[PDB]
Design an enzyme around this catalytic site. Structure first.
Site, mmCIF file in Angstrom:
data_model
loop_
_atom_site.group_PDB
_atom_site.id
_atom_site.type_symbol
_atom_site.label_atom_id
_atom_site.label_comp_id
_atom_site.label_asym_id
_atom_site.label_seq_id
_atom_site.Cartn_x
_atom_site.Cartn_y
_atom_site.Cartn_z
ATOM 1 N N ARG A 63 31.490 26.950 63.421
ATOM 2 C CA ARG A 63 30.572 28.264 63.502
ATOM 3 C C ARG A 63 31.031 29.512 63.528
ATOM 4 O O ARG A 63 31.516 30.031 64.523
ATOM 5 C CB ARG A 63 29.590 28.142 64.710
ATOM 6 N N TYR B 295 28.777 40.562 66.076
ATOM 7 C CA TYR B 295 28.287 40.869 67.519
ATOM 8 C C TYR B 295 28.189 42.288 67.715
ATOM 9 O O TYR B 295 29.331 43.074 67.432
ATOM 10 C CB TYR B 295 29.118 40.242 68.560
ATOM 11 N N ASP C 151 17.689 32.420 78.772
ATOM 12 C CA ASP C 151 19.014 32.942 78.467
ATOM 13 C C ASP C 151 19.238 34.300 78.482
ATOM 14 O O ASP C 151 19.450 34.966 77.563
ATOM 15 C CB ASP C 151 19.014 32.450 77.078
HETATM 16 MG MG LIG Z 1 23.043 31.438 76.909
HETATM 17 MG MG LIG Z 2 25.068 27.323 71.934
#
Ligand SMILES: [Mg+2]
Ligand SMILES: [Mg+2]
Ligand SMILES: [Mg+2]
Ligand SMILES: [Mg+2]
Ligand SMILES: [Mg+2]
Lengths: 282, 268
Positions: free
Chosen positions: A78, A89, A152
């Site tokens: 990935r 990023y 998250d």
């Molecule tokens: Mg996370």
């Molecule tokens: Mg993940």
């Protein structure tokens, strides 16, 4: 002193990075103290993904001593895709060790279960970090991301060695010295999996970056979840490998686990498929 | 077949990239035909700078066979700084060979190649022109052709400047911004565009390209300190095949490190 031990070539399935202390592996999840300086709220950040890179390198919860390995999607490496105007990023990206987004309870701020991983950290300083680096950071604020509907949180942080660190003490200072960065951060975490065929993510609080005080409170919660986890007292530890070499009061303490790790076998970075260059317009 | 010959380590003063044809160095300015297919307006682009890099690499007009080298200011290697939200250059950046802006900025016309794949320094790729912008930098007109690699998966859908807006929404805005601000971290002023920063269309771009090619035709037939040595144009005063043989062999040196300061993101 923390160093890294690399197995294999970066950008392959065999790549692993263990964090070492005194030249011996320790758990990147469990054995690095959350706090470098508790009294001054200086944290140890484990860096996973350098700014402007794509390979989705992460602490591996199910492998002994939790080395950093590249994530896979259906068996294939990935790489996060480039989403215009961003390149990979846009922060040094990693995690606080000794934390857990508890998946077994719904979190009141987001009304969602945790994503089963350490709390993650967006380190905004000028120097590009390296995978497996342990750096010391100050927390500045936090954002409540719902990543595919799971809690998250992302902590906003700066390397204490950054030239600007003394001028950054709370979240409003990020906007002063890095104008546009927080807004870009909101967009990034919303859109970054759209090229993978996933839906847009959403934030609680309409994406507001909550302040340092708020961030410390949430970091504490995740540390407390981890303390339960590592003690063997979680209602469901999700097959996480709890092996550690520094926490003698835990049921999974094992100084010897360190010796069983292969020696470094560092090879040159393997080439990445040219598809990963592609800039997606969303 | 075009390849590259690298002398020295990247990110050093010694670095040079020559273009080779079937193994022999040729001039990157004079020996590469502007046209890959004149009839269909397919151009050869000499790539100088890959997307998302910082080292300011350019065809040097003053060295024999015009190798690509790193720009310097008063002895120091030049790296373009990262200007938020951009990372280095936001295009594959290069030049059309056999063009010359007769002063007018004194250089070949520059090319912003917008395709998905990151290019390599010294690459000769084939592109189609989509449009053009006229940047003003220090009293000099500095045309930037917007182009796309004909091998890009999207190339058949992109024929004129309006197609950039459809398939690459926000790229033209970013281009305008980038070229305005990219030297502010160096202490230089903001640049400006003619036409209020409008990207003119393909037709307008072809008119500029042909003009700068006609100038270069005059140049190479016989000049502000430009080396006109070439190895493929036999009836030019400065034809010299021996020039190709005088070029050193390739160094296989690994890239030198770049100072960590170049990582910095500037908010300007
Ligand atoms: Mg996370
Ligand atoms: Mg993940
Ligand atoms: Mg996850
Ligand atoms: Mg220049
Ligand atoms: Mg120019």
């Amino acid at each position: 002193t923390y160093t890294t031990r690399q197995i294999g070539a970066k950008n392959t399935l065999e790549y692993k990075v263990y964090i070492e202390k005194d030249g011996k592996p320790v758990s990147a999840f469990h054995d690095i103290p959350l706090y470098a300086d508790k009294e001054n709220n200086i944290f140890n950040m484990v860096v996973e993904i350098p700014r402007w890179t794509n390979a989705k390198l992460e602490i591996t919860k199910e492998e002994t001593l939790n080395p950093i390995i590249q994530d896979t999607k259906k068996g294939k490496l990935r790489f996060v895709r480039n989403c215009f105007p961003h390149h990979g990023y846009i922060h040094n990206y990693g995690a606080f060790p000794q934390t857990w987004e508890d998946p077994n309870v719904s979190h009141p701020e987001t009304k969602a279960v945790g994503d089963n991983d350490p709390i993650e950290v967006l380190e905004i300083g000028e120097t590009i970090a390296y995978t497996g680096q342990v750096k010391q950071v100050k927390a500045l604020g936090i954002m409540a991301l719902l990543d595919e509907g799971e809690t998250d949180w992302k902590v906003i942080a700066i390397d204490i060695n950054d030239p600007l660190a003394p001028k950054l003490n709370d979240i409003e200072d990020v906007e002063k010295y890095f104008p546009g960065l927080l807004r870009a951060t909101n967009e990034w975490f919303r859109i970054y999996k759209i090229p993978d065929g996933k839906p847009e993510n959403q934030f609680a609080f309409s994406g507001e970056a909550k302040n340092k005080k708020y961030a410390l409170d949430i970091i504490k919660e995740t540390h407390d979840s981890w303390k339960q986890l590592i003690a063997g007292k979680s209602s469901d530890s999700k097959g996480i490998d709890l092996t550690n070499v520094t926490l003698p009061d835990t049921p999974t303490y094992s100084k010897a686990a360190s010796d069983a790790i292969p020696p470094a076998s560092l090879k040159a970075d393997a080439p990445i498929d040219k598809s990963i260059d592609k800039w997606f317009f969303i």
